[PDB]
Amino acid sequence: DIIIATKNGKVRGMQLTVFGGTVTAFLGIPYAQPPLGRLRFKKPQSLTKWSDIWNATKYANSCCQNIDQSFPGFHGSEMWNPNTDLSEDCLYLNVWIPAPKPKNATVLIWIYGGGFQTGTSSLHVYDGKFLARVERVIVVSMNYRVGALGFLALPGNPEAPGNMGLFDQQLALQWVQKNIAAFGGNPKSVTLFGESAGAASVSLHLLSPGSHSLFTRAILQSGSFNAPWAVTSLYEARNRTLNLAKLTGCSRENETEIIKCLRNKDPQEILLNEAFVVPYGTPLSVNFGPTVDGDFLTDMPDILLELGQFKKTQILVGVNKDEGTAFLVYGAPGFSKDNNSIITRKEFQEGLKIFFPGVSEFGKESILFHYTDWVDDQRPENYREALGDVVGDYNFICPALEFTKKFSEWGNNAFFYYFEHRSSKLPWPEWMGVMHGYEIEFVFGLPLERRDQYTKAEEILSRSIVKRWANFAKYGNPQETQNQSTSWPVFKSTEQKYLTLNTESTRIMTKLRAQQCRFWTSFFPKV
Template identity: 75%
Template structure:
């Protein structure tokens, strides 16, 4: 046997070298080379170190054929099979979208811009699997927001690894088409029927049903969750019967299908499509010729011109969004909601404290991210007129009357905060509350939250408060990464939210096996209890923004009706009046009605409308605690009529 001069066996030295090499190769390859066989082909994932453990990520798995050429604007087609191993170790393309260039280099806006290449070949999804690989794990499918105009699943704020690691659930996130490429429609024409982006989401959910078992997931325990337009998308799936078998439960964060920005009428959708076609020189003798022309335009040209389809300025710039197509959506959302045509399941839903501020810095007079945005009364009034361009003058006046702090009407902070409340109530909070009330009325278990914590990492100014979208980092567990320097209290809050969301996904209740602390109550149509989420102890309150939402749901539509005006995109409706009376708002109705009475004394015809409306209210307003609230003095109105006519 050969030996070295020091007596060590050459074979022994060779064996030691071989073992070291083997350990190195084993360390590199198996950790970075994980292969799973889906129904369409094999995919290679990657192990990620997370909080002292491991999560296996499969990034950029294709679920749909690239919607190019003749497939543009159409429903997606399932991805064809592939023969090679698909590399799913890095994020795929983002769908074509306009980039927010309002504040170049500013982290608060740049964090939402796509971080991968833009392409129409973008129908991909991501899967995060806890390690060791589970058996029959609950699945949580994330749908991003972006007003149906933008968004991508590859953003760091949507990283599913912390949720998968801490709660041992499988997290899935999906890309879907947005803007004109996702929602352009000529209703009734199969070349562009509308809702392509929603059908993308449904196809991804079908992929989950067919494939999640090989990742260790349970296809019978799938919870959808999303924020803003993602939450509206979740509610669309709740309202669309073909989606019902594809998921189990739902979580809606700051958005719902009945929001004024979330649906277009047929006529408005058609007008916007034809406007875009004209801008792109796509004229034709029929709709099919127009669509064929649009299918052959450069996608960047479509993006650059879609911003010109609106006939008026708007803080919430939604150019193309879902429509009633008779397929995915059979009626307008509020009609389906009123008729109770939901998937019968459990719902976790909520909103943030300052939902409106995110939109104000994008064009409201006097607002800026670089100062305190203390606006005066004139800027407040102009801002409202621009925010509600289709409302009558009296409609705008009624908003001013309701939201002005009459005890301190010269305070610029109050006008700034009122604009936040108006935009947030009208576009987010009140539609979400209405959806929730109808959903709970059917006996479904609902859990409502009110997120109150302003992140210590927030780049936006202090006056913007707890902004739209900034609960997401806590739901995905970003504060658990110590090197990012969140506070300890924020880490604790994030862990609590992770547990709430995952427990709800697993069991249908966020409380899980919790014994200590505040238990999250069920939301009912009568008590309307909700839980606060912040770094302090959670508290339980009732009837969030009840007075303000009563204004938007009942009073404001009546004002528009009286003046012969309506909002084309007005989605909030009046039918809740008989179901959910709120004594605190009756006083407000009376004072607003008297205000309108005085304002209308000069106009006999409008006074007649007002008289009938006030009489209607006086007959329908109930009594509470043995106190009947005052009815309108009709004789005063009649005298005002006579004065106006003389």
């Protein structure tokens, strides 16, 4: 029976057998006041204190959110849907510790993605027990509010200031500063990691001055805040908040009154109207996301990055070979998970209109021109592959490389990876390749479980990535030093070396997507 005294009271954990050893898991520890009633849309308030033993022995409620119903019964989509009850009462976190209790263990804090609209820390692919067993690190993950409930903004107004879910993440970081030594963690050795919006979130903590002292370093998987979906303009945030009001019958003249009305709405009515606050979305829409609130974020983040205003520390950044494919089967015409999706030029053109709705005709033609010069055989898959690369390059890969360059120019070591292994268990079809989100299970060490039907080469790839991540967190250097592995060189401006992660042979390469990213980075923003 394992009980830990925290600043707010006692917590009971549970023991787990993992690989012939034990991990102690504390699932569902609260770290804030439930944000209900008058607290809805406000910054998380600090926890009152309890007396008695809080039983942290099951995952807590996931935050309210819309759910992906495009492929019911299909594991490829459903694995990402929440696996605990939805409730506004969702501000909880999990702690996995090695057994016996470590003395001063490095801490890995996971921030999930989901577009800032969805996600929960209790998914199977985020289970931190394998990392605690194998690397003897402590792993922490928190639920944070998503959608309008997490990111509604009327900026400057403390009834709905914006970025509440980023403040939920920050308050969990603070909980780890105050409490983790009780669990055997070193509050001075904390690495944030996250994927997609969780990676964009990690990048914004590098920018936020109230996060500077809450962590040591950062890992960004397929996301960074300069991605075109990651930050909402003040203009679009106000418009969306008042669009939400209009839809829920909460248009008022005093803005504090709009929010008060919005506080009387059933959470379902808020969720049901979120999709419509925008005149046309895309599969990549982030209707309620981070804004420049003057609090968490003091200025436009592109300006902070460019002018070197961020935490000086090491970063590890990477992307997957086919980031954009997952999004094509949520509305691009001629695409389907259930066939090979050989599409025509006309379909490609229609697909750009689906992904680039506010963009001028010239803008869309410039994309077509950059991506359709083949290269050369015709090649029925030409247009199918180009559309996935358009979406992946624009939304994930070029912003990650641009973030990595600008960050490294200010003197800190940066390491960049390109993940190019397709999981042998992937339920999505082959044409979708190495999809967005499908390195995560390798990072959390799921293929280390021999009972799970991953191949032996995958068990080895995962073990090595697990070691590199842990070495990054502990030592700021993502090497695998014992097995004659390829040395991972720092990513510098000028050379731009990156490491490929694959089952066959790790390679050092240079200037990932050089020609494509010149297009998105220097020309497209003008269009």
